[PDB]
Design a protein around this ligand. Structure first.
Ligand code: 402
Ligand code: SF4
Ligand code: SF4
Ligand code: SF4
Ligand code: SF4
Ligand code: SF4
Ligand code: SF4
Ligand code: SF4
Ligand code: SF4
Ligand code: SF4
Ligand code: SF4
Ligand code: SF4
Ligand code: SF4
Ligand code: SF4
Ligand code: SF4
Ligand code: SF4
Ligand code: SF4
Ligand code: SF4
Ligand code: SF4
Ligand code: SF4
Ligand code: SF4
Lengths: 448, 186, 180, 174, 183, 183, 174
């Protein structure tokens, strides 16, 4: 299991039942509940809504030392333990770090650099890339990479996929493939529409696949001892990283993921302070990205990132489409119209998972034709995922910081990155070029 | 035993010129100066007579008279003893209410009244109060004196006074004198 | 569950009454729709006089007084004591040693048996009941009309309109169905 | 509107059967064992008096805890929330509310029955809405003095009296 | 056990003269050196019934002496007890736990400082000055003393001591005579 | 001098969600490096109001701010003082006795170790380890800080800060208006 | 927390046997024969006073030779190391420490008994940890006024009081 509910601490307040879209929480108005783990999409918002915290000044419960073994957390955290607990993977990361025979690489998501700063008494939403990378290299990690490389890769792949699908339209209302809880829900309840969803992999999986077979070629390390851990703000990528069909080049692309809170626990356990450390830069070969890949943490940023190159793919003329403010919001479903290549596209972006059900019907899809739809299960995007820290009960600071980081960089379109050009001219050739179908494409066939 | 009887249903009425551990645990403290308990008990009898709480069956069936004590207690009024003793007057009414409507009442007294010159009147008045309330010959009610030594009672059943013989018999009677003359010895 | 026809014993009118019994204990009482006297409705004592038969204080064993206190004692030796007491008093002073107080709230067979077993066993005319205190009425009516009891029948007083003359009116709270 | 019960004093013997039935039905149901129908003696006639279900109540307007409320077609006391503030006893014109106290019973046959058989709150005629049969008082009466009046029986009686008056005035003299 | 009496006002014959509270204050505080004369009163005035005036006239309100009294039940310490026929608060054991003010819906209980032997009564350890002891004041129906003093002091004779048993019989007889004269 | 306000719960609108105690702990302990985020909490969690659930539902229990407070009277050291409109305990003069526990009938106070600057506090001379200093904990109505944090954090607004003076006037007015409209 | 003992003054007769039982039991083991539980006469009530074991212990913060220490769940005075510097007496708020001097005994029955039967360091109720049985002051009281309290009993009493208060508030009015 991943999401559980302790029966010694749950009080039956039913609050967490009012936020998960699947309603997998079964119980009464009182008494402890239980998670229907066979239908849960692992979104994580039932964790952050929990507020039972039973202290250790009484001996009527477990002695709080064996509890840190069940939850999988570190033994030197001394933070309050809640009821709706995530499963912990920090101990296995620590044991892998103890072994000096593993060429260790780590990945950074475009929502950790803003989230981690609140874990050491700083301002909420302080953009700290340099401190994060310096601390990561001080955590005995041999290499640090950014998952935004795979974000640029999946932007190019999805743009080419949309250009291919706009000609001789076959299941044209295609959906984005960046939120694995959305894929799990679509395979759970609406199995007949799974071919609509694009066959492009999540950015972490492309990054891991490139690390395992291309990162082992630019270096002198065999692709058998590499230990890859991705830091994702999500109680959602662990299920994504252990599917039977989610491996390439023989081995797993991503071994096991850790959220922001587990990274903070590892940071505190090693006894390294955060404010004193200076700034540093990521590794050049697989850490150079653009601002279009930076806005995926916020909701709807995939749309600008895809359009900034889809416009050039369709019209073949460079005309500015850097910024749009009509698709940026925080709730419900948002719609827009785009005129490109003497073609009109009706675009929608959905924050949440329930708010796809009105536009997923076989009758409603025919009446709107939904030329491109972007979906995020967690509200307001991955900046409000399960990996983000508790808030003792805000969101706008993180998204404003991400947009400021996008506006600060001198590279905006996700096409001018020299690393992507070098990768295409050396290893992959052309997109959809009988090589990406083995490394960057998946077939969504659980048929659940 | 007295304080263990306070099973949320007992009523303690204590009268004491001094201060001890018993008066601090009683709801009613009828503190009276020494030697002024005779007007207090006379007013007690007067109040319980005036309220009409007298069990007439016992006095009619066993006692020889009722008006004899009424002739002596009607002289003393609650106000008369109020300025005679300097104590609140509502306390007497409350004590009468607690003593009268109850079924069993036990009266105790320590060495303080026994070592008094005029204790005969005190014990006679206490006996009269016990008779008039009908709380004699019943379990949990009656006059309950206390003895200051272990074997005083066994020094009364046998001869230990110059006017008594073993068996609660008086030596002034010649019949008891001739009752034991040879079995006793000389 | 089971219904038994009985006559209500609380007053002298007499009414049909179904003793609705269940698990051997009375659970209710019902009126008889075909009875000619009450016509299917009863007073307070008929409807709620069944809560008198199973009180927790019902006398459940014979007791005798030996030294001033009653003691639970079986039937046969108590009958021995009664028999020898009656025998000795009859031997001493004859058959006038007792006066029989037969109940007015018992069936006619009880009174007949009491009379016979006070007259055909020891033999005396000392039988009485506590319902004499209407005694001049039976004497007067016998001396006037030769009839010692009721003349007419109750349900005929309401079949058709008559003139009803009441002497010493307490029928409204002595027989709550005749006044009905 | 509301359903209630009325007793014409022509056929009431004062036999105390309706009062005892009303007490004992409520006792065996699980509510207060006290009767909610009071027998009153006057200079000319004896009539039982109960709660004529007032359509404005003058009762729910004085209850501070809001215990008295209209349910179905009757006024219900809701004994569980009643606290004992003797305010509805002031505002009842006919005096149809008494309180569950042993001393509230007058000396009669019913008192003897209830003492040979064996919370303080305001009890009122609830019209026996919990019982599938009709009211117990109207059903156990030896002379059928009480009678239950509905919303439609009032209209029928009004129409009958009105038609009789009109026909008599027409027939005799215009 | 029988019904307890309670004094009730009469809005038709009340003016708002406040001459019924002063009698109550003067009759309860005989131990604070009052001699039925203004000038011997050396303490602040505390009545038990409270006069309230609104658009539809004015009247005094006080404790109705409930049988299932909420104030007696919520009092955890046990100050409020049904000692006599009426309900009375006890001044020795009260601690000022204000749950009484959340229990009574009429609002006939008020928390005010205690005054004994003509002086304010202070506490042992509180704040740097001392603080006075606060006690709950409510009507006790003059049980310790004689007949009620708010009555016999009302000039318009508005306040009445009603026993809820005789009033019911009177109303029943009135209704029976009113209905039986018409049928 | 004005009556001490206190917070009260509404049991009909409480689900026992335990989101009111966490806010209280997070708002008192700002000197122990808490940044409105779990992860910065390096101390045991200690609230001031305690949730309790019985078969008739659940609600929290907190200090009632008694006027004649027994917890202050028992304490011979005099650590408990009334500083403002609320009664507060002093964490510097407490000798850690437990006679303070035997007085309060509501049980809103508990003896727990003190935590300052994110660490346990240690005494000077006991036993070979040092025995941490232990202080009383009770609700102080957030007098040093702003408005109460138990209120404004409850999702159902079951907690309300009640002033025991205006309530009596409102209940008096309501009772008078209800009585005038009928009689 | 620490364990201590309290006596409710409702059932203390002043019979002077708890103090003598405390004295002689401590005498027979070889400690200081003088008693460690005191009796106080007040204006309102008679209650014995003793060492409620201060969990912060102001006694040990002023002792200069470090002769007071926490053992088990109690405070121990370590009579072998006390010198008589009457500084712990100035810091004890309850005044539960007296010194082994014959003049410290008041005229009572216990002094007469000790006189007919026949080093100066601070003495203090050490809760009788040297005896496998409980305290001698709690199992010799003719009224059983004294009672020992631990952490578990304190928690049970707190929970009981809180639950009773909540149930009362729910039952009456929210
Ligand atoms: N993989 C992936 Fe994504 C990327 O890049 C994350 O990391 Fe998101 C975030 N932050 C999460 O979870 S998933 C959905 N697309 C937008 S962002
Ligand atoms: S993980 Fe999400 S969907 Fe599953 S129970 Fe929790 S909140 Fe609901
Ligand atoms: S939020 Fe926590 S305590 Fe409340 S029902 Fe869900 S798991 Fe239980
Ligand atoms: S928004 Fe991100 S963390 Fe949340 S379910 Fe989707 S992919 Fe997972
Ligand atoms: S009138 Fe009443 S008491 Fe008499 S027999 Fe009939 S039911 Fe029984
Ligand atoms: S049952 Fe009928 S006759 Fe008997 S008292 Fe009641 S109303 Fe009168
Ligand atoms: S006695 Fe009961 S019904 Fe009457 S006003 Fe008070 S609470 Fe309401
Ligand atoms: S109790 Fe009286 S006033 Fe109230 S509804 Fe019934 S009859 Fe009307
Ligand atoms: S209707 Fe029912 S409750 Fe009302 S008086 Fe008749 S029997 Fe009693
Ligand atoms: S204020 Fe006094 S009377 Fe009221 S509940 Fe508290 S202790 Fe009892
Ligand atoms: S104080 Fe209020 S609740 Fe208490 S008895 Fe008086 S009126 Fe009733
Ligand atoms: S009845 Fe007595 S105590 Fe109550 S308000 Fe009137 S005068 Fe005051
Ligand atoms: S004395 Fe009478 S008229 Fe004057 S305020 Fe009081 S109740 Fe009203
Ligand atoms: S616990 Fe603290 S405040 Fe309470 S009595 Fe003891 S020293 Fe005083
Ligand atoms: S701690 Fe208890 S006794 Fe002290 S003021 Fe708070 S509720 Fe009252
Ligand atoms: S008022 Fe303040 S201190 Fe008291 S419980 Fe609420 S948040 Fe905590
Ligand atoms: S926050 Fe509100 S609803 Fe939740 S436990 Fe506290 S009082 Fe109850
Ligand atoms: S043994 Fe008990 S009753 Fe005797 S003096 Fe000691 S505490 Fe008091
Ligand atoms: S008298 Fe003894 S215990 Fe007290 S401070 Fe001096 S050495 Fe320490
Ligand atoms: S001697 Fe006094 S100060 Fe020291 S622990 Fe005992 S009671 Fe506390
Ligand atoms: S515990 Fe031992 S030393 Fe302390 S008072 Fe009791 S008998 Fe004396």
């Amino acid at each position: 299991a991943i999401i559980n509910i302790d029966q010694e601490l749950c009080t039956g307040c039913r609050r967490c039942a009012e936020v998960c879209p699947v309603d997998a929480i079964e119980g009464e108005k009182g008494k402890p509940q239980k998670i229907n783990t066979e239908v849960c999409v692992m979104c994580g918002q039932c964790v952050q809504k929990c507020s039972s915290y039973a202290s250790y000044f009484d001996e009527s419960i477990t002695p709080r030392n064996v509890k840190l073994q069940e939850r999988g957390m570190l033994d030197s955290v001394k933070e309050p333990l809640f009821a709706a607990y995530n499963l912990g993977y920090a101990r296995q990361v620590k044991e892998a770090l103890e072994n000096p025979q593993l060429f260790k690489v780590v990945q950074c998501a475009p929502a950790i650099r803003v989230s981690i700063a609140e874990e050491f008494g700083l301002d909420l939403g302080d953009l700290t890339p340099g401190k994060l990378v310096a601390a990561l290299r001080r955590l005995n990690f041999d290499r640090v990479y950014d998952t935004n490389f795979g974000a640029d890769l999946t932007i190019i792949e999805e743009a080419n996929e949309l250009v291919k699908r706009i000609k001789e339209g076959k299941d044209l209302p295609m959906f984005t493939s960046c939120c694995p809880a959305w894929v799990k829900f679509a395979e759970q309840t609406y199995p007949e529409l799974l071919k609509h969803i694009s066959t492009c992999k999540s950015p972490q999986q492309m990054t891991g696949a490139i690390i395992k077979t291309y990162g082992a070629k630019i270096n002198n390390v065999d692709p058998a001892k590499i230990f890859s851990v991705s830091v994702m703000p999500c109680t959602c990528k662990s299920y994504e990283s252990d599917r039977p069909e989610m491996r390439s080049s023989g081995y797993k692309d991503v071994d096991l993921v850790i959220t922001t809170r587990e990274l903070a626990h590892l940071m505190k356990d090693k006894g390294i302070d955060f404010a004193t450390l200076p700034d540093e830069e990521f590794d050049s070969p697989l850490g150079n990205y653009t601002g279009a890949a930076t806005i995926f943490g916020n909701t709807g940023g995939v749309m600008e990132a895809a359009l900034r190159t889809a416009y050039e793919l369709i019209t073949k003329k460079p005309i500015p489409n850097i910024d749009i403010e009509f698709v940026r919001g925080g709730e419900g479903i948002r719609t827009a119209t785009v005129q490109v290549g003497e073609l009109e596209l009706k675009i929608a972006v959905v924050s949440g998972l329930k708010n796809v059900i009105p536009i997923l019907e076989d009758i409603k899809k025919n009446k709107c034709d939904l030329h491109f739809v972007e979906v995020m299960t967690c509200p307001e995007g991955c900046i409000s995922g399960g990996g983000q820290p508790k808030l003792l009960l805000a969101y706008k600071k993180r998204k404003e910081a991400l947009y400021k980081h996008d506006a600060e960089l001198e590279l905006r379109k996700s096409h001018e990155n020299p690393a992507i050009k070098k990768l295409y001219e050396e290893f992959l050739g052309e997109p959809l070029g009988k090589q990406s179908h083995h490394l960057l494409h998946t077939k969504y066939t659980p048929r659940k | 035993h007295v304080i263990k009887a306070k099973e949320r249903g007992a009523k303690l009425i204590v009268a004491d010129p001094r201060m001890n551990a018993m008066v601090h645990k009683a709801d009613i403290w009828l503190r009276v100066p020494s030697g002024y308990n005779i007007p207090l008990i006379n007013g007690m009898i007067h109040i319980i007579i005036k309220e009409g709480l007298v069990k007439t069956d016992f006095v009619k069936n066993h006692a020889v008279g009722f008006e004899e004590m009424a002739k002596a207690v009607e002289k003393y009024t609650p106000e008369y003893v109020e300025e005679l003793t300097g104590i609140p007057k509502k306390d007497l009414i409350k004590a009468a209410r607690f003593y009268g409507q109850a079924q069993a009442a036990a009266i105790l007294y320590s060495m303080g009244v026994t070592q008094f010159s005029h204790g005969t009147g005190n014990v006679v008045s206490l006996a009269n109060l016990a008779v008039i309330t009908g709380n004699l010959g019943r379990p949990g009610a009656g006059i309950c004196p206390l003895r200051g030594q272990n074997n005083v009672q066994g020094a009364c059943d046998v001869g230990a006074l110059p006017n008594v013989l073993p068996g609660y018999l008086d030596v002034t009677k010649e019949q008891n004198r001739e009752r034991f003359e040879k079995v006793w010895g000389v | 569950q089971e219904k038994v026809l009985t006559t209500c014993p609380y007053c002298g009118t007499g009414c049909g009454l179904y003793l609705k019994v269940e698990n051997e204990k009375i659970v209710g009482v019902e009126p008889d729709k075909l009875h000619p006297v009450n016509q299917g409705e009863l007073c307070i004592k008929g409807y709620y006089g069944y809560k008198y038969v199973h009180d927790p204080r019902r006398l459940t064993s014979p007791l005798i007084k030996k030294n001033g206190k009653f003691v639970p004692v079986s039937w046969d030796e108590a009958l021995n004591f009664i028999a020898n007491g009656l025998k000795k008093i009859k031997s001493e002073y004859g058959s006038d040693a007792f006066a029989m107080f037969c109940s007015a709230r018992a069936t006619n067979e009880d009174n007949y048996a009491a009379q016979k077993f006070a007259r055909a066993v020891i033999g005396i005319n000392n039988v009485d009941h506590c319902a004499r205190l209407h005694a001049p009425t039976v004497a007067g009516l016998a001396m006037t009309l030769g009839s010692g009891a009721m003349t007419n029948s109750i349900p005929e007083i309401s079949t058709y309109s008559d003139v009803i003359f009441i002497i010493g009116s307490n029928t409204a709270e002595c027989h709550p169905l005749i006044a009905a | 509107p509301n359903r209630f019960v009325i007793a014409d004093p022509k056929r009431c013997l004062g036999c105390y059967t309706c009062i005892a039935a009303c007490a004992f039905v409520h006792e065996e149901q699980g509510l207060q064992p006290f009767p909610r129908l009071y027998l009153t003696y006057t200079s000319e006639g004896i009539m039982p008096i109960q709660c004529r279900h007032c359509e404005d109540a003058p009762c729910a307007e004085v209850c501070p805890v809001e215990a008295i409320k209209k349910e179905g077609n009757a006024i219900i006391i809701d004994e569980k929330a009643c606290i004992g503030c003797k305010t509805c006893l002031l505002a009842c014109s006919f005096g149809a509310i008494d309180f569950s106290v042993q001393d509230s019973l007058e000396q009669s046959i019913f008192k003897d029955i209830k003492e040979n058989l064996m919370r303080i709150v305001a009890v009122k005629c609830d019209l026996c809405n919990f019982r599938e049969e009709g009211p117990a008082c109207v059903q156990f009466c030896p002379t059928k003095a009480l009678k239950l009046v509905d919303g439609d029986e009032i209209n029928k009686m009004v129409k009958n009296k009105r038609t009789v008056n009109v026909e008599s005035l027409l027939s005799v003299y215009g | 056990t029988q019904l307890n009496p309670f004094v009730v006002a009469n809005p038709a014959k009340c003016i708002g003269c406040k001459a019924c509270e002063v009698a109550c204050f003067a009759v309860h505080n005989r131990n604070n050196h009052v001699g039925a004369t203004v000038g011997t009163v050396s303490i602040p005035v505390i009545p038990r019934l409270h006069l309230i005036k609104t658009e539809h006239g004015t009247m005094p309100i006080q404790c109705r002496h409930c049988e299932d009294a909420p104030c007696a039940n919520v009092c955890t310490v046990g100050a409020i007890k049904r000692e006599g026929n009426a309900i009375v608060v006890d001044e020795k054991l009260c601690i000022g736990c204000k749950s009484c003010l959340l229990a009574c819906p009429f609002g006939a209980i008020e928390l005010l400082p205690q005054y004994e032997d003509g002086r304010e009564v202070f506490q042992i350890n509180l704040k740097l000055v001392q603080e006075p002891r606060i006690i709950a004041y409510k009507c006790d129906l003059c049980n310790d003393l004689g007949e009620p003093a708010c009555v016999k002091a009302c000039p318009e004779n508005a306040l009445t001591l009603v026993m809820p048993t005789e009033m019911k019989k009177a109303r029943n007889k009135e209704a029976a005579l009113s209905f039986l004269r018409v049928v």
